[PDB]
Amino acid sequence: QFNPYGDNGGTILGIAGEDFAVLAGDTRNITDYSINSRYEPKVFDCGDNIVMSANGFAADGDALVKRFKNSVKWYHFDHNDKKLSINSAARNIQHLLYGKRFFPYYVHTIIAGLDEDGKGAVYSFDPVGSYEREQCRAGGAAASLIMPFLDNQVNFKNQYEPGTNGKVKKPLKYLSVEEVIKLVRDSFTSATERHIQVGDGLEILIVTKDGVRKEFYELKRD
Amino acid sequence: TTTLAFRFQGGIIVAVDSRATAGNWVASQTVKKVIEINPFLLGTMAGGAADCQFWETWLGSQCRLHELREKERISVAAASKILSNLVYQYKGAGLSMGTMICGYTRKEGPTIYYVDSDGTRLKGDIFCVGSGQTFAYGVLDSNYKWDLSVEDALYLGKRSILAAAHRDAYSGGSVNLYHVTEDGWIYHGNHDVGELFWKVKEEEGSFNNVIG
């Protein structure tokens, strides 16, 4: 029987700073045990300082990103070139995803940018449009490897102040863009080592008030 | 998930956990399972995250249109029945929702309606909904009285989620507390099970099963 879904592998990672946000994703595209591309970007600038990735089944991923980009275009037309806020984008994507509740988009969606107060924001979605704002989210094949590391290093979980008898927690604080990119690079090198569907390249899109900057780093190609 | 809502002298108490899972994988421990439809209406979520979140947000739109059209806040009965009549249209399609519509109006007083995705709609004084409902019932039922103080009722609601958070593998993260009075709903904070368990264990002298 014809199976309409497939798995194109790869993994994505969104972290939110004080006055910035990053959305990173590996550039490997696979089917079964074959590499399709060593460089196929799946983290996109959608305009209005929103970056988006829909990891999983690449066909559904591209369809969704395409539809949201188009949604941004018509928002401008219908509402006098008003800037689409990240919170408004998030709700719009819920409606896109849930629209196919009974034939879902087989993707995990993450968007990043700045909220209306100018502070870093990350929103993550299930395949049928349940969404939540977070400081931190990994998505895709190696999400189970990266996420518990982020819990430990970003949100400082299970870490107690030395000599306080495990009574005082390590205090939460915003990370610098330099410190966040270190964690992204170490998350992806670690993921590449232990997951076969992750590697080839890492592409990071950094969002500040000044706009969207890109950074690229090599990953192991085995 | 684990959500309870009960009625007492001082109004309604609503307690939920914050854990979201994808099988045995813990997706999040920072999920809001209570939706604030309006100042006098609360909605609880269990089962499908997307289904609950989408349709309870939509319920909030329908309740707003009611008060624009009728110049009057919607009754808890009418609000609960809009949701129950909606899910009933989708019956057999595979929506997954366990829901409690909690609120106060003048004509009704404090009211709780259980609404689930196979179209069941029940008025009641006590409900526990989710994978850890039985664990919450155990503690709640054995300690419940109508004459509980607002302070004691808030604690019992909190302690009943903690009880489930502990035993149920698919419940935990943190406890979100609400109190519904004649004046509307009041938020009584987010309580991380990480700290709350040891605090309760020490102060209450309970949880003797655990290595202290």
């Binding site: - | 994808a22 399972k33 269990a46 995250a49």
Partner: peptide, 4 residues
């Protein structure tokens, strides 16, 4: 599919 997320559960609650």
């Amino acid at each position: 599919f997320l559960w609650x």
